[PDB]
Short mmCIF file of C-alpha atoms in Angstrom, two decimals:
data_model
loop_
_atom_site.label_atom_id
_atom_site.label_comp_id
_atom_site.label_asym_id
_atom_site.label_seq_id
_atom_site.Cartn_x
_atom_site.Cartn_y
_atom_site.Cartn_z
CA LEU A 1 14.67 -55.27 -2.30
CA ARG A 2 15.76 -58.10 -5.55
CA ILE A 3 15.88 -61.63 -4.43
CA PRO A 4 18.54 -61.70 -2.11
CA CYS A 5 22.09 -63.76 -3.22
CA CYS A 6 19.00 -66.69 -4.41
CA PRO A 7 15.36 -66.54 -3.08
CA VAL A 8 15.33 -67.92 0.37
CA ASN A 9 12.06 -69.50 1.60
CA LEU A 10 10.01 -67.52 -1.28
CA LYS A 11 11.22 -70.21 -3.56
CA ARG A 12 9.76 -72.98 -1.57
CA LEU A 13 6.82 -70.21 -1.39
CA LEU A 14 7.56 -70.18 -5.37
CA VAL A 15 7.77 -74.43 -5.07
CA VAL A 16 4.12 -74.81 -3.54
CA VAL A 17 2.33 -72.23 -5.60
CA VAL A 18 3.96 -74.20 -8.70
CA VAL A 19 2.32 -77.16 -7.63
CA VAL A 20 -0.89 -75.43 -6.28
CA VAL A 21 -0.43 -75.02 -10.12
CA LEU A 22 0.00 -78.55 -10.80
CA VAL A 23 -3.29 -79.81 -8.78
CA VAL A 24 -5.44 -77.51 -10.90
CA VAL A 25 -4.92 -78.28 -14.26
CA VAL A 26 -4.43 -81.42 -12.72
CA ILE A 27 -8.46 -80.14 -11.61
CA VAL A 28 -9.00 -79.63 -14.83
CA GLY A 29 -8.13 -83.08 -17.42
CA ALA A 30 -9.57 -84.47 -14.24
CA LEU A 31 -13.03 -82.37 -14.50
CA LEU A 32 -12.57 -82.76 -18.46
CA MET A 33 -11.90 -86.66 -17.90
CA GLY A 34 -15.90 -86.01 -16.53
CA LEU A 35 -14.90 -85.79 -12.39
#
């Protein structure tokens, strides 16, 4: 329950999520440019 004492591997999971979101934003920008 809660974060233990800073999130463990969950942190790098969050980083992966952020990367995914960034990549999606890149895909969106790319699509807006053309593809």
